Design a protein around this ligand. Structure first.
Ligand code: A1CA8
Length: 312
């Protein structure tokens, strides 16, 4: 059943993935590294177990629903190829005690980004295959307009190549070609696979609500805002805000890695301490404007001028 070519090759790819994550977990013995999410030391066994559940489920089912691009088999082919490529990059960073960082550092930034991507891959798989059971054809996006767009444009498909997704999105929210399209791909493609899944679109539309001005929100909140930090961990935000400890009201924001679709705002309190706040269901600009009115969110990344969020 397409896109797989031979009978049992999806099963074999799943077995490969599990064994690869087992080895990769063996390479994470260093008691440094951290436990602060996202941590490979816990994500890797969780993701391996999820893949074991997927494998058992699709063996019993033999294996998926209708074949073709955008269904569960296609999703798994791309997902497992991506998982393998990212695992290879991680394995190249880790030892045969690991390399000392002590970051700062280019290398601990790379490793942190890979950890984030592993957190995103885990969440995507968990969202689309709860208990190992594919639900992409029934998946409900949180924002109703976004749900309606995805089902009218993409149908039952749970994943699309960037090019087709961009064409479909652009019938509704036009995407300026070139650098802007590439910045949008980078924001939306949480797993860094060059494909957009229904889960990634769910997260993007929750983060950059409200729907009618979606890409405007993204431009004002991500592209044009110096407080926005892409692919940053909790620990990295802490390290970054240390340098603004003497400037209460310094703040940065980032998509949470643990509560996907929600924001995490780190800021310097009037005590010089670093606090994190995760807003409710309000759009981000409302939380930021109220925090500016209240004195908490005055200096994005410690800079003097706070962008005006009234004007779209
Ligand atoms: O994919 C599945 O396992 C699947 C399972 C149940 C219902 C629909 C499904 N997929 C539709 C599809 C396939 C290619 S494009 C759209």
């Amino acid at each position: 059943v397409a896109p797989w070519g031979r009978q049992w090759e999806e099963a074999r790819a799943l077995g490969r993935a599990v064994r690869m994550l087992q080895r990769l977990e063996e390479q994470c013995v260093d008691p440094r590294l951290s436990v602060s999410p996202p941590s490979l030391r816990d994500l890797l066994p969780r993701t391996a177990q999820l893949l074991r559940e997927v494998a058992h489920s699709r063996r019993a089912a033999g294996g998926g629903g209708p074949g073709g691009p955008g269904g569960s088999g296609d999703f798994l082919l791309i997902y497992l190829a991506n998982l393998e490529a990212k695992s290879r990059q991680v394995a190249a960073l880790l030892p045969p005690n690991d390399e000392l960082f002590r970051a700062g550092s280019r290398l601990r930034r790379q490793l942190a980004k890979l950890a984030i991507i592993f957190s995103h891959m885990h969440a995507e798989l968990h969202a689309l295959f709860p208990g190992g059971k594919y639900c992409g054809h029934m998946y409900q996006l949180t924002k109703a307009p976004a749900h309606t767009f995805w089902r009218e444009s993409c149908g039952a498909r749970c994943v699309l190549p960037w090019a087709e997704f961009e064409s479909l999105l652009g019938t509704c929210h036009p995407v300026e070609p070139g650098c802007t399209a590439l910045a949008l791909r980078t924001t939306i493609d949480l797993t860094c696979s060059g494909h957009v899944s229904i889960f990634e679109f769910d997260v993007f539309t929750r983060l950059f609500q409200p729907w009618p001005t979606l890409l405007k929100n993204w431009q004002l909140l991500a592209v044009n805002h110096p407080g926005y930090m892409a692919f940053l961990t909790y620990d990295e935000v802490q390290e970054r805000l240390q340098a603004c400890r003497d400037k209460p009201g310094s703040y940065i924001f980032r998509p949470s890695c643990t509560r996907l679709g929600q924001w995490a705002i780190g800021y310097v309190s009037s005590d010089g301490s670093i606090l994190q706040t995760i807003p409710a269901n309000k759009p981000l600009s409302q939380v930021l404007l109220e925090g500016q009115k209240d004195g908490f969110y005055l200096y994005p990344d410690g800079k003097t001028h706070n962008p005006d969020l009234t004007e779209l």
